[PDB]
């Protein structure tokens, strides 16, 4: 009855949403310069109403007393929607004669800069020249492409033109043609034609033939000649595949160059990684020389007191040959107009408020190009990076879980487990040349991520003009003029203004390495809270969460938590639960009451209560302690078949219980990685007759004191041909085990330990790769412990890709002839220090 009216209004509300995100997605595409201010204000109000209605729908979905509150809220929200409807109508006009000219390209004048101005461009222009002109001799090699990927303004067109200006006299044709974000194909092809001959094709931009006949014309004009065309700023490769068909004929002696801000489109070119040309930020010395070329006249030591300021500021840009140009031109109107005080003001300004200046916004357009080219469902992901402090590495797992918990990841295919979707989001951010990845974690994937500084402050401002985030920084020390409309709060070094009076609808809150938490701030006052992040704090009082119901992410890494409340079962909605580095050593029984999780970063020291099999949706489990366990609990682990990654260490069940779990593993089929830890023993878990899950990539083994008797039989190229990681240790070793392992397809990472060599009195023998020729197409990382791996397992045509190799070498083989090295192998196999044994 009463609930019927509410639920019949909810679907109307969600349709309202769908339309409103439709409109907001439409408006945000255009840059905020052609957008009239009235529409901008209207759009901002639309966004605020969108937050309100999302709040109402989430509250109703979580709950089902409350019915009347929901009713009043939804009615009043309808009232503001209705009121705001006709404000747009009431004050609006047409102005047929408003045709202002389209803005010119901000980065065209940069194309017209002095040649004798750029420093350090050398020893990269030459290298790019001879990485493709080396085949120019014997100018009959098949045509190839060399793309140039990079981020921001590290300089691609500059180097492309530099190479384009030296080697041309030895060519018959050529063209330097640009492409915008949304090109017109006929315009592009007219551009190419005009670049070849301006005589026959002077008015080639006039005739409007079609997309096809002019392609035929350009194909015809390209016979029995070497062209060397270069095309730059190609986005959304779907456009590029049109042009590639224009070059579809055999033409020895010609090559072409491409540039783009997406590596995820250059691999679509040149079919090979050796033709991909990464470009790097300049070195510190070259950057210093370039920086002092502008401001200082000819000499550098005259200040001798702002020098440290110079290095400190130049470190912010890193290596970008555009940011430093901008800063140098801004910093001196005429011979050091400023000295050492406003320089500190400038340094403090970056991060929160440097961008709003004069003659500075002309470069921020170049940076926002990339942000605007993003599709939807990715603007929030990029804008989410403003929460974390300036210079701190960000683990990608935290990012993915935060996104999922927030609600930025969703679909309706049902073929996706919703975690790899967020991983795909992250990889798309990376391949767009917008985030720097670092390291490889225990997942087989990238470890953490870092953000460029002048992009960080830029996105900080961009999220700041709306209420997407809120930052409390000492250099900034600013608060929005409306305490009510705060959704995301990212507390940092500042520990003074910690007021919490007027944020009823606080979506998310985080604290970074501060002791101000708790003694000044209260979280329980937040009636709603989506995610909570408190890693690195020194407080153990988290027992008020029972008052919180909408929580999804709960990070407590390194928190000195002694215990957590028994009343946690009320959190039916939850996605992550990290407890690593905490003092608590037993979990409450009220965890079987939980229904939804995907990850559980639990400590093996802690105790896992019985009934773990109920968490069917669980998708990854880390560091499970298996000691003093009964059979039914072990068998429960086979029921929930949703795992991709599992980590196990144990000390107290080395019985047939190992075999009982051994087949229980095979019940799952979604595994990606696995590893087992056990101390100084023979492996009494795995049998030789047990089908493995079809999908396995990592399969690690952390322990080195334990050992297998021999290589397991169930390891074969037949089953599990997805391995890219080996990490084995065993007692014996066989010259046939290596031959067997050389049949698996990928095996990117290889690491084998011979227990008997370093434990018992044994001589490191020389295993022989008998059968086959290569057995190792792509194995870059190979590690042999206690096993003799001489370079002469085969000629260089065995392991094309192998950067690293480790093995042991007896001193008695020095006088032998089995160490016959001296030649250079295909990969970078020149850096090695072998462990030699007397």
């Amino acid at each position: 009855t009463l609930e019927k009216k509410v639920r019949k209004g909810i679907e109307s509300l969600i349709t309202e949403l769908k339309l409103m995100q439709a409109v907001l997605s439409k408006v945000s595409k255009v840059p905020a310069d052609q957008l009239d201010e009235g529409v901008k204000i209207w759009a901002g109000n639309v966004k605020e109403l969108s937050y309100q209605m999302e709040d109402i729908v989430d509250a109703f979905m979580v709950r089902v007393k409350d019915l009347h509150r929901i009713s009043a809220a939804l009615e009043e929200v309808v009232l503001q929607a209705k009121q705001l409807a006709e404000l747009r109508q009431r004050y609006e006009q047409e102005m047929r004669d408003t045709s202002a000219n389209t803005s010119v390209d901000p980065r065209m004048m940069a194309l017209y800069t002095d040649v004798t101005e750029l420093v350090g461009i050398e020893e990269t222009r030459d290298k790019l020249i001879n990485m493709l002109t080396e085949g120019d001799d014997w100018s009959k090699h098949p045509l190839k492409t060399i793309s140039i990927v990079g981020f921001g303004g590290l300089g691609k067109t500059t180097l492309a033109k530099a190479a384009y200006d030296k080697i041309k006299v030895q060519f018959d044709c050529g063209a330097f043609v640009s492409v915008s974000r949304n090109p017109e194909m006929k315009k592009v092809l007219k551009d190419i034609l005009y670049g070849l001959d301006k005589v026959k094709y002077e008015n080639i931009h006039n005739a409007a033939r079609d997309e096809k006949y002019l392609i035929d014309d350009i194909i015809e004009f390209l016979n029995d000649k070497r062209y060397l065309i270069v095309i730059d700023d190609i986005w959304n490769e779907k456009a590029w595949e049109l042009i590639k068909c224009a070059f579809s004929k055999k033409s020895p002696g010609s090559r072409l160059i491409t540039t783009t801000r997406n590596v995820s489109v250059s691999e679509a070119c040149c079919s090979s990684e050796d033709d991909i040309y990464r470009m790097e930020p300049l070195s510190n010395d070259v950057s210093r020389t370039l920086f002092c070329k502008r401001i200082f006249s000819q000499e550098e030591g005259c200040p001798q007191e702002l020098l440290k300021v110079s290095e400190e500021i130049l470190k912010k840009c890193g290596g970008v040959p555009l940011a430093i140009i901008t800063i140098a031109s801004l910093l001196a109107n005429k011979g050091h107009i400023k000295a050492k005080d406003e320089w500190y003001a400038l340094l403090s300004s970056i991060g929160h408020g440097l961008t709003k200046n004069r003659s500075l916004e002309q470069m921020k357009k170049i940076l926002l190009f990339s942000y605007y080219d993003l599709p939807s469902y990715l603007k929030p992901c990029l804008l989410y990076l403003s929460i974390f402090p300036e210079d701190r590495e960000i683990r990608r797992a935290r990012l993915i879980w935060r996104w999922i918990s927030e609600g930025f990841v969703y679909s309706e295919k049902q073929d996706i487990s919703l975690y790899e979707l967020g991983d795909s989001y992250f990889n798309e951010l990376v391949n767009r040349s917008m985030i720097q990845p670092i390291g490889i974690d225990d997942e087989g994937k990238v470890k953490a991520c870092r953000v460029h500084d002048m992009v960080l402050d830029l996105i900080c401002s961009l999220s700041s003009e709306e209420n997407f985030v809120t930052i409390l920084d000492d250099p900034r020390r600013k608060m929005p003029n409306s305490e009510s409309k705060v959704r995301r709060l990212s507390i940092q070094n500042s520990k003074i203004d910690v007021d919490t009076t007027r944020m009823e609808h606080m979506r998310s809150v985080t604290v970074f390495s501060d002791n101000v938490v708790g003694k000044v701030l209260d979280i329980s006052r937040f009636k709603v809270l989506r995610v909570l992040d408190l890693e690195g704090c020194h407080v153990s009082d988290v027992g008020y969460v029972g008052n919180l119901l909408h929580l999804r992410y709960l990070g407590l890494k390194g928190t000195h938590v002694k215990d957590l409340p028994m009343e946690i079962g009320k959190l039916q909605f939850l996605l992550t639960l990290d407890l690593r580095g905490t003092k608590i050593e037993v979990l409450p029984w009220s965890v079987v009451q939980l229904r939804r999780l995907m990850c559980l970063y639990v400590d093996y020291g802690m105790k896992l209560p019985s009934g773990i099999g109920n968490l069917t949706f669980l998708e990854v489990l880390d560091d499970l302690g298996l000691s003093d366990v009964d059979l039914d609990f072990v068998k429960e682990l086979g029921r929930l078949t949703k795992l991709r990654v599992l980590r196990l260490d144990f000390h107290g069940f080395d019985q047939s219980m190992g075999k009982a779990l051994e087949e229980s593993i095979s019940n799952m089929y979604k595994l990606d990685s696995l590893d087992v830890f056990v101390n100084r023993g023979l492996i009494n878990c795995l049998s030789e007759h047990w089908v493995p899950p079809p999908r396995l990539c990592r399969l690690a083994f952390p322990s080195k004191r334990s050992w297998f008797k021999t290589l397991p039989s169930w390891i074969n190229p037949s089953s599990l041909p997805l391995l890219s990681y080996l990490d084995i240790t065993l007692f014996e070793v066989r010259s046939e085990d290596i031959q067997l392992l050389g049949t698996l397809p990928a095996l990117v990472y290889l690491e084998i330990w011979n227990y008997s060599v370093f434990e018992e009195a044994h001589e490191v023998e020389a295993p022989v790769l008998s059968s086959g020729a290569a057995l190792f197409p792509c194995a870059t990382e190979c590690r042999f412990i206690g096993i003799g791996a001489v370079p002469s397992m085969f000629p260089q045509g065995a392991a094309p890709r192998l950067k690293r190799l480790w093995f042991t070498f007896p001193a008695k083989w020095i006088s032998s002839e089995n160490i016959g090295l001296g030649m250079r192998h295909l990969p970078s196999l020149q850096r090695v220090v072998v462990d030699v044994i007397s």
């Binding site: 390291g439 490889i440 974690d441 225990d442 470890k447 580095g581 003092k583 260490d649 830890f677 101390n679 100084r680 952390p702 322990s703 080195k704 004191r705 370093f758 412990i785 480790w806 220090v833 462990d835």
Partner: protein, 394 residues
Amino acid sequence: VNFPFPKKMITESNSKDIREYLASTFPFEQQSTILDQLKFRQENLAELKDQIILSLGNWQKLLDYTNKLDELSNTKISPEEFIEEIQKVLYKVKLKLYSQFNLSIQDFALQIIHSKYKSNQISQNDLLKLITEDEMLKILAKTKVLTYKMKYFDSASKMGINKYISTEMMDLDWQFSHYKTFNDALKKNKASDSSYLGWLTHGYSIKYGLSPNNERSMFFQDGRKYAELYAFSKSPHRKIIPGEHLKDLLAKINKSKGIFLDQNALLDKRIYAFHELNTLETHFPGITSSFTDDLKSNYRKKMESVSLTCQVLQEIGNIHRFIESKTEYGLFSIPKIFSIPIDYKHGEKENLVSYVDFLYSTAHERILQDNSINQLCLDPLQESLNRIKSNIPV
């Protein structure tokens, strides 16, 4: 009293001046000097049940195993059965006053094997075949620290030497005189297991409060740590280009190395950081070989200089525990008949107060001085020198 440095010299025809007395007196028989009998514990094996019968009323298993241990103490059994006989209680007991007698049950039982080993009653190979067992490693690494803390910590705290308790410098105690075999023979036969057992031992010492702290120990109480610890123990080229879960360990090593190299910060946490660090290199040589940073900080000599300070203070505390007794020797350490009366001994005036001067001259002869070292070496040495010259006459 601000006692100055006792400038003396230990030269030829002077080491035997006092060591000759030290070679036969009640102390120093089971110890050594930096300048370089079975009835005693049989009587304790007899007195093993002094107070057990007083409160047997729960408290019956103590006496039940007490007579079994007394039986096995004197009965002659072949080695291939004696281990099984003695392990029947070792593998049986699980866990205030109770534990007190429980530790004596375990501590006295294990000393029998060494007593029979020094008599060549137990074959060396037979002992080797059992010491490699994992459980007795954690048994000994627990009972040693428990036995030390139950008896010596109470008197060490009052003297102010509690802050300078070194886990690695424990075998030199006269009471724990049976560990040289367990250390050296095991090291000669199984070198890796010695470092492994020391690593295990220090973990409990941290947890039981020998080196307490409010912050977690990221180097102990986790098997995955020993994984990399033993992984680099066999490869000479793994620190130059490390792997994952190895940058973090190096970061926590160098962060504490910088803490130790600091001067102004708090001292107790520096003492804490000393213990695990010193445990690290001795068991795992070439682990903090920062070839660049150490040379421009004299770190290699600084570690030895601050290590010798605890060695000196150990013997000073031993002398203090000897002077008043003439129970600070510890419970169940010295039996009543073999006890020491209150009367002053004439041989003390010639071999104790003079020997203190030799000890302090040896302490103050080759230790470097630094503003950080002064707060770590000079100040405690001066405090001990002041305290040692205000109690000898009385």
